[PDB]
Design a protein around this nucleic acid. Structure first.
Ligand SMILES: [Mg+2]
Ligand SMILES: [Zn+2]
Ligand SMILES: [Zn+2]
Ligand SMILES: [Zn+2]
Lengths: 97, 388, 113, 49, 194, 196, 140, 263, 47, 49, 133, 66
RNA sequence: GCCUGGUGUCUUGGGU
């Protein structure tokens, strides 16, 4: 089955549903339900699907590198000023963005 | 500045690291920068007015950094997709398919020139494929001179046997082509092709000579064979057109049936879709399959000698859809992922009546570019084109 | 601004020899002849003539770049004959054929006059 | 001015293709070649040159 | 630990096929004569059959291959895909060895069985990504090359070395040295702005 | 007039061009690969129509949305002694040997655009600087220097050419020497170098 | 005269020939639409000529109905950059920049609308003899 | 052994068949006549007055293209090889032109027939602008209206077409061989039937068609080359063919000289 | 030097008979800005 | 000229709308930032006085 | 002085794909299950169906840099009409007596099928093929 | 601007045939026939005369600037 | 008798 809209926690508990394999394309919700390591795999799956769709192929290590940066703090750091410049990096580096 | 000084060469926008590679200067008359043609691809350069930038290192330390890290042969394989980003292109790629056809033969007098055109040639003329009644070499033998020894590559296209009736696949043993037309699948930029293989076995220096050797042989041979294209090559014969016209005529009838069913409540609803979405979806699938079917008919009728077919088959420019649109049917025009909208009240143009959902009303261009477009079709084509 | 002088196609600089012969010692009895300030016009004429001689085993030429009026010819002969001598023979043959050819045109021309 | 800036020893012009150049070569117009320069240090091995 | 320019799609041959086709390809039976190695490819064929001590190695070989296939099919590559980007392409290295040493011939090979099994097993300890004797490093070093070791063992299996590739003593020692040298060359270089 | 634009790649004198049997040589050779993916079929038809037009002596009417067909133009052309699709046998100029393929050949209207190379070529060794930044000035008309932008910076990082990047942005541009105080770290030092 | 608002309420035939029904099978020429959704049409107006939908720049293109649509846009831009003879009094005007082609020729393939744009009287280009061929590889 | 058969002839074009030679020799003769047969042509224009509507170098450019009688040019030296100080009578011809329109109405057309030879290497027949008849005004150079004057001095020099196309004595050179394609050097493009769709050569009746049974003679070579040399009147057609052969001889002779001197 | 910027005619070489102006006269080798093509040439003083 | 800007992406003022037929040219429009916003009157257009 | 010799009847001549090459299949008149598949140049050596062809395979024509043959010397090829030189690229040690030998003459391909006793000597690096009549 | 001296493509002189061409058009000959009478047989030469535009007649109308 | 300075801020139109 596939749904419009999400409620990952409640749907997992429903008898009949294989509770060990249910997947959502909102990784923000995955983080709240399954934790940071599951978010890593889900983030990778969603990026790869985008790139591979128009037949392109990017070697694993590049997409892997991007998602480790996005999950190293334990929460999702967006690639915007609100994420990037909340780091303990030097002021000259941060002000250049 | 003098011969063999390294300089950094660069075209904007610098989207990835092979936008900046080190080249060796050769001073020449006339005011343009000259590039060997096989580097146009990584720069995404062409010669329609593009400009490029050159930077000269100013010390002993940076000259060495350029030649040992940034130099062109080191950049042949890119880390982006573990495959080459440079291959044989355009004229040389079109020509190398023609030259390595099974029935290309070259007499002795021309063969001697071609061997001498290879800078890396060892001076040993190879024995002709035919000794009697007249010495004749095949194209595959002379191309093989440009490939260094010790190179083995095997590829199977469509489960071919070692007897290769269709002259497809590829087999290379000790740097000599046993069988197989050489096309985009072997000397293009694809992974696992010829260029990738020479790089692993021989290193970047030898692999850089491979580009130069192949180019000098093929462009000479192609100069004396010639190649052209004309208006004749877009024209399918009268028998094929009636097939073409029938498949489009029958597709317009099926679209009529769909309109009838949807208006008489006899149409199946697709999951997740309203009636009008389902209706619009089914019509679009029918019309795109109609053009592909008509395109397939036009393609198969074209003889092997037809010049449009030779470029499509080589992979050097063009694809199936281009044969289809020049000769058979331009097909459905799309805007914002949907058919042409009713920008007038309930109609697409003031030359139609309201509530007309037929193919011609909502942007199906029946004619080919050869035949010429009608005025209604023309505007719709300009709408789709503008969006691009 | 960077166009070269057009007269440089045929006028020889004083420090530049019209003709230069070097050996190709990698194989026996092979020379490289570099022709300065010449074209396909001269080169193709010599090449075919040479190829019909029985003692020439290899002859070829290339114009390496059309923006420079030169070409280089490679000539290998069998052990008996010396390549440079064979080139002289090819030259004299063609001068003779053109002398004959000029004569026969003159005769035919007066008849139509 | 700091993350990027204008620089000396640069040049720019229209490009053309040439099949009779090696892969790693670039043909450079004479006029450009007389304006750009490289500072070569004088040693015992090149002083005569 | 690898550089992106140095990998190519290679097939890992212990993943596809049925258990029967697998067993046909990899198993050596020194008891049942018709399921042993063909006699015309080895010189020492007489001293082979019946040897229980040589059968202990070949059993340990096949048991190792069974572990790999079970690990890869149930944990690593659940969907059965067996073509994957991997370092240093063994197929090309072998067919080059066939050319240098003219490895045509039915001339029975002088390459003994214990040289093969011990040769390959010793190779997998020299594929150094990280050096140092610390206990954690050795675990990390073994983990980094787990997939590649399976790839090597799937190719340099006893039956394939002898029946299919037909290597002799000179060529096989060369193949081991080349794999060892090229794997080192395929490591990413420190300082790379990845 | 069909969006098929190009720059001159080389020039050839009269006798090196390919020629037709009548001794007509082209003024200009464009590339066959420009046609199939761009699908400028009108360019070919214009060539065909203009061939007919120059033989019979009039300017063909090429207005869009008329009854003129390719076959009608082709019929006229064959009746004048030329192959009906516009092809002609041609001969290689270097050797005199025939080309194995025949070449589409005929008049086409070409237009000279304003972009000429001697209006674009530019080089700078050293030269004038801005008063404010002491960096090279902007623009061809002022002997300016090319911009080493943010994206070119990134490419040199990817190459790992750290030494080259340092030199470009200092010695080859606006390098300056300052004095600092080892205690307070400010550029407040007053340095008279002849008095030391 | 009709404007955009009144155009919404009228029914326009594309050419005079479409005003009357007809009695072909020429495999080269273009297919005319069937128009079988309405049984009988009641036309109120007719286009004077459909080629007048183009503007000044696009009217210089011979056969625009045979081109992929972006090429007509690209030529409409480039046409404004092509040297010709911008006026006949160039010797007495002192403009910042002016370009005059030495030997303008009128094109062998023209359109009817060019008569009024004066293009044959002030042409901007030359008829080159063109071979489409792969020659030395200096035209890739 | 080379044979020639002249099919037609007149002052400014010779049509001829060339036979029993190699393809390369026929082609080298074609190239030599276009590119290396010397002629005489204006190469320096001194404008003392030009008040016409045409730009100075525009008029000068047209002057360079005017064909001049070049019959005795072989005895004349190149300017670059003459031992003299500036020009003189041995290396140049001087021409002068002066036109003017008096009257407030009408247009004075300046024609190439107003070019007056002033000096020249007497008594060699060189330097007069070529004329068809005696009442032929010749080539249009300029047009003048009331008070506009053109007074120029032109220096004509010996040159070859390699330097600039104005020195070429030929126009087109028609050239073909093997009208029925017996050698199979071309592979014909066709839609339905190759023979009906390709026109016949204008020399189709000078050779016999291939017989319907006939096998392919893989030893046959090209052997008959029909060519027509048109000229601009700067040289007569018979002179161009003769001097083409002569010029090609000295070039080969010069190569032969250098080998016997380099030892 | 007394001959800079004065008009000059060339009496030997490939540019014999052409007008020019002395642009730079450092020593032995002059720089004449030729009138006829837009080029400034290096030339010896004997010419 | 339509004075909408360069601020505001989308497509609606830039698209060739159906009602442009016969009033502005379907082909003539600049490349780049002004694309689709600057238009040109068809040959037979007029403007009400 | 040769490695193989036999006479073949031509069963099929496939033109189709090319104008100058045809594929021929033949079976030995004297020994069935010995089959020959061979590409040949049409214009130089036209063959028809049911033609009898003597096919010899040698590893040398003597009774590295190719030279135009002198008219004075003499080789095995003086008595044949059509000679080709090629590379053996597959030696199939097949089932009971199914042996196939694949040779490439510059992309003109040959498959020779037959028995071990007839073809054991053909395990060579290079082969000439000589065709008579 | 004014009739070119030479055909661009082949070099045959055509600058002496412009006056003869205008006179033939007054006598009612068609363009193709007029070119035929002048012996301009190759179509490279024909384009030169058929498509030239004579602008110099317009520039002369601007009353001389001395 | 060596050194040797010619603007900026915008706007608009273009090129890839
Ligand atoms: Mg571009
Ligand atoms: Zn301080
Ligand atoms: Zn003199
Ligand atoms: Zn002409």
């Amino acid at each position: 089955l596939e749904t419009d809209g999400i409620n990952l926690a409640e749907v997992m508990a429903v008898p009949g549903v294989d509770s060990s394999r249910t997947y959502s394309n909102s990784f923000v919700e995955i983080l709240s339900v399954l934790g940071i390591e599951a978010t890593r795999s889900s983030l990778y799956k969603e990026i790869l699907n985008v790139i591979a769709f128009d037949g392109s192929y990017v070697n694993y290590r590049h997409m892997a590198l991007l998602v480790d940066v996005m999950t190293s703090r334990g929460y999702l750091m967006a690639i915007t000023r609100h994420g990037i410049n909340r780091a303990d990096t030097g002021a000259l580096m941060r002000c250049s963005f | 500045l003098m011969d063999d000084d390294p300089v950094l060469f660069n075209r904007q926008p610098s989207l990835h690291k092979m936008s900046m590679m080190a080249h060796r200067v050769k001073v020449m008359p006339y005011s343009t920068f000259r590039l060997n043609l096989s580097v146009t691809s990584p720069y995404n350069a062409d010669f329609d007015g593009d400009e490029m930038n050159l930077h000269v290192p100013q010390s002993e330390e940076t000259r060495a950094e350029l030649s040992q890290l940034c130099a062109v042969p080191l950049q042949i394989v890119s880390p982006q997709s573990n495959k080459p980003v440079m291959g044989i292109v355009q004229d040389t790629l079109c020509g190398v398919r023609k030259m390595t056809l099974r029935d290309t033969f070259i007499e002795y007098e021309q063969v001697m020139n071609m061997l001498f055109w290879v800078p890396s040639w060892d001076g040993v003329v190879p024995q002709p494929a035919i000794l009697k009644p007249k010495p004749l070499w095949t194209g595959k033998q002379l191309l093989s001179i440009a490939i260094p020894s010790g190179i083995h590559l095997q590829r199977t296209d469509g489960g071919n046997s070692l007897l290769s009736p269709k002259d497809n696949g590829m087999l290379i043993v000790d740097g000599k082509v046993m069988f197989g037309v050489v096309d985009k699948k072997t000397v293009g930029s694809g992974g696992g092709g010829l260029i990738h293989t020479v790089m692993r076995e021989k290193g970047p220096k030898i692999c850089a000579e491979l580009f130069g050797n192949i180019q000098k042989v093929v462009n000479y041979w192609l100069l004396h064979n010639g190649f052209s294209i004309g208006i004749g090559d877009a024209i399918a014969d009268a028998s094929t057109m009636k097939e073409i016209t029938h498949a489009i005529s029958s597709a317009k009838e099926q679209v009529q049936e769909i309109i009838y069913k949807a208006q008489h409540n006899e149409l199946e609803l697709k999951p997740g879709m309203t009636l009008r979405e389902s209706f619009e979806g089914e019509v679009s699938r029918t019309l795109n399959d109609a053009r592909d079917s008509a395109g397939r008919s036009a393609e198969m009728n074209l003889k092997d000698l037809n010049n449009v077919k030779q470029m499509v088959s080589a992979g050097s420019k063009g694809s199936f859809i281009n044969i289809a649109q020049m000769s058979a049917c331009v097909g459905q025009q799309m805007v914002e992922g949907k058919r042409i909208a009713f920008g007038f009240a309930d109609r697409s143009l003031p030359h139609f009546t309201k509530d007309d959902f037929s193919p011609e009303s909502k942007g199906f261009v029946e004619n080919s570019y050869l035949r010429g477009l009608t005025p209604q079709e023309f505007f719709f084509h300009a709408m789709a084109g503008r969006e691009g | 601004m960077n166009a070269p002088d057009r007269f440089e196609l045929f006028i020889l600089p004083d420090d530049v020899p019209k003709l230069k012969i070097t050996p190709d010692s990698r194989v026996p009895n092979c020379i490289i002849i570099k022709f300065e300030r010449e074209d396909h016009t001269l080169a193709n004429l010599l090449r075919e003539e040479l190829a019909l001689y029985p003692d020439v085993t290899f002859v070829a030429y290339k114009v390496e770049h059309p923006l420079f009026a030169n070409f280089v010819m490679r000539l290998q002969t069998e052990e008996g004959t010396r390549p440079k001598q064979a080139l002289e023979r090819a030259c004299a043959s063609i001068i003779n054929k053109l002398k004959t050819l000029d004569h026969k045109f003159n005769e035919e021309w007066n008849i139509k006059n | 001015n700091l993350m990027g800036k204008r620089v000396d020893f640069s040049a720019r012009t229209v490009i053309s293709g040439d099949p009779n150049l090696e892969l790693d070569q670039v043909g450079v117009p004479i006029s450009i070649a007389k304006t750009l320069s490289y500072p070569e240090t004088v040693t015992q091995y090149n002083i005569h040159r | 630990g690898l550089d992106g320019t140095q990998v190519e799609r290679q097939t890992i041959d212990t993943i596809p096929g049925s258990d029967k086709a697998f067993h046909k390809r990899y198993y050596v039976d020194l008891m049942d004569e018709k399921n042993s190695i063909k006699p015309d490819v080895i010189e020492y064929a007489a001293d082979i059959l019946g040897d229980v001590e040589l059968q202990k190695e070949l059993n340990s070989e096949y048991e190792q291959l069974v572990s790999d296939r079970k690990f890869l099919r149930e944990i690593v590559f659940v969907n059965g895909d067996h073509n994957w980007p991997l370092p240093v392409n063994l197929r090309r290295i072998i067919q080059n060895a066939q050319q240098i040493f003219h490895l045509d011939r039915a001339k029975a090979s002088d390459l003994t069985i214990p040289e093969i099994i011990h040769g390959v097993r010793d190779l997998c300890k020299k594929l150094f990504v990280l050096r140092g004797e610390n206990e954690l490093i050795k675990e990390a070093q073994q983990n980094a090359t787990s997939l590649f070791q399976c790839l090597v063992r799937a190719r340099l299996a006893t039956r394939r070395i002898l029946e299919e590739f037909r290597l002799n003593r000179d060529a096989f020692e060369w193949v081991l040295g080349t794999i060892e040298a090229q794997f080192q060359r395929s490591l990413v270089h420190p300082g790379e702005m990845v | 007039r069909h969006g098929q634009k190009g720059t001159i790649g080389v020039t050839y004198r009269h006798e090196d061009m390919p020629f037709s049997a009548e001794g007509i040589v082209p003024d200009l050779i464009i590339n066959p690969h420009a046609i199939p993916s761009r699908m400028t079929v009108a360019h070919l038809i214009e060539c065909l129509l203009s061939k007919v037009g120059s033989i019979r002596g009039y300017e063909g009417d090429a207005t869009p949305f008329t009854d003129l067909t390719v076959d009608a133009v082709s019929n006229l052309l064959r009746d004048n002694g030329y192959q009906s699709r516009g092809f002609e046998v041609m001969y290689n100029g270097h050797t005199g040997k025939k080309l194995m393929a025949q070449v589409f050949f005929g008049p086409t209207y070409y237009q000279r655009l304003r972009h000429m190379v001697d209006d674009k070529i530019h080089a700078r060794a050293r030269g004038p600087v801005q008063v404010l930044t002491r960096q090279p000035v902007e623009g061809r008309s002022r002997d300016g220097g090319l911009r080493f932008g943010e994206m070119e910076r990134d490419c040199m990082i990817a190459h790992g050419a750290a030494g080259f990047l340092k030199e470009r942005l200092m010695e080859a541009s606006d390098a300056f020497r300052v004095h600092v105080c080892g205690i307070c770290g400010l550029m407040s030092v007053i340095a008279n170098l002849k008095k030391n | 005269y009709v404007d955009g608002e009144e155009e919404e309420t009228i029914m326009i035939a594309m050419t005079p020939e479409d005003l009357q029904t007809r009695s072909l099978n020429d495999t080269a020429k273009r297919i005319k639409p069937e128009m079988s959704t309405s049984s009988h049409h009641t036309f109120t107006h007719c286009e004077i000529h459909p080629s007048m939908i183009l503007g000044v720049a696009a009217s210089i293109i011979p056969f625009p109905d045979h081109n992929q649509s972006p090429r007509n846009t690209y030529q409409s831009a480039m046409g404004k950059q092509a040297m010709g003879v911008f006026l006949t009094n160039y010797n007495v005007r002192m403009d910042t920049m002016a370009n005059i082609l030495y030997y303008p020729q009128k094109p062998l393939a023209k359109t009817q609308a060019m008569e009024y744009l004066k293009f044959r009287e002030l042409p901007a280009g030359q008829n080159a003899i063109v071979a489409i061929a792969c020659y030395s590889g200096y035209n890739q | 052994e080379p044979k020639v058969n002249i099919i037609n002839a007149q002052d400014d074009e010779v049509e001829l068949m060339l036979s029993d030679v190699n393809l390369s020799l026929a082609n080298s003769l074609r190239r030599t006549m276009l590119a290396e047969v010397p002629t005489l042509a204006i190469d320096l224009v001194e404008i003392k007055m030009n008040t016409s509507v045409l730009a100075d170098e525009f008029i000068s450019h047209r002057l360079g293209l005017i064909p001049l009688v070049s019959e005795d040019v072989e005895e004349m030296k190149y300017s670059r090889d003459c031992t003299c100080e500036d020009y003189c009578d041995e290396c140049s011809v001087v021409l002068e032109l002066s036109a003017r329109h008096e009257g407030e109405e009408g247009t004075t057309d300046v024609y190439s027939s107003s070019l007056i030879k002033v000096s020249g290497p007497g008594n060699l027949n060189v330097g007069e602008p070529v004329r068809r008849d005696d009442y032929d005004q010749g080539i249009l150079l300029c047009k003048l209206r009331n008070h506009q004057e053109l007074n120029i001095r032109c220096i004509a020099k010996k040159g070859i077409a390699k330097e600039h196309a104005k020195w070429s004595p030929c126009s087109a050179i028609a050239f073909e061989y093997d009208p029925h394609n017996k050698l199979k050097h071309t592979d014909f493009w066709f839609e339905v039937d190759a023979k009906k769709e390709w026109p016949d050569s204008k020399y189709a009746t000078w050779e016999e068609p291939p017989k319907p049974g006939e096998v392919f003679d893989y030893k046959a070579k090209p052997n008959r080359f029909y060519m027509t040399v048109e000229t601009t009147g700067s040289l007569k057609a018979n002179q161009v063919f003769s001097r083409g052969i002569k010029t090609l001889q000295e070039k080969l002779a010069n190569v032969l000289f250098e080998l016997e001197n380099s030892r | 030097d007394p001959t800079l910027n004065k008009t000059v005619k060339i009496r030997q070489g490939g540019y014999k008979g052409k007008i020019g102006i002395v642009k730079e006269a450092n020593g032995d080798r002059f720089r004449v800005e030729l009138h006829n093509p837009n080029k400034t040439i290096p030339i010896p003083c004997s010419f | 000229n339509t004075p909408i800007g360069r601020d505001g992406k989308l497509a609606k003022p830039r698209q060739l709308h159906n009602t442009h037929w016969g009033l502005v040219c379907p082909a003539e429009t600049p490349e780049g930032q002004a694309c689709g916003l600057v238009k040109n009157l068809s040959l037979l257009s007029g403007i009400s006085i | 002085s040769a490695l193989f010799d036999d006479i073949f009847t031509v069963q099929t001549v496939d033109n189709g794909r090319y104008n100058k090459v045809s594929r021929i299949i033949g079976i030995s008149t004297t020994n069935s299950a010995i089959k020959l598949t061979l590409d040949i140049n049409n214009e130089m050596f036209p063959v028809s169906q049911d033609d009898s062809l003597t096919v010899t395979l040698a590893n040398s024509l003597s009774l590295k840099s190719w030279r135009p043959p002198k008219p004075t010397d003499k080789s095995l090829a003086d008595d044949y009409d059509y000679v080709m030189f090629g590379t053996v690229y597959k030696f199939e040690e097949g089932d009971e007596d199914k042996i196939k030998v694949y040779v490439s003459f510059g992309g003109l391909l040959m498959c020779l099928e037959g028995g071990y006793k007839s073809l054991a000597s053909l395990k060579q690096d290079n082969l000439y093929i000589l065709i008579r009549r | 601007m004014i009739i070119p001296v030479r055909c661009f493509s082949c070099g045959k002189v055509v600058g002496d045939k412009w006056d003869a061409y205008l006179r033939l058009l007054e006598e009612g000959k068609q363009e193709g026939d007029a070119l035929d009478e002048l012996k301009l047989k190759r179509y490279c030469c024909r384009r030169m005369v058929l498509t030239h535009v004579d602008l110099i007649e317009k520039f002369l109308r601007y009353n001389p600037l001395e």
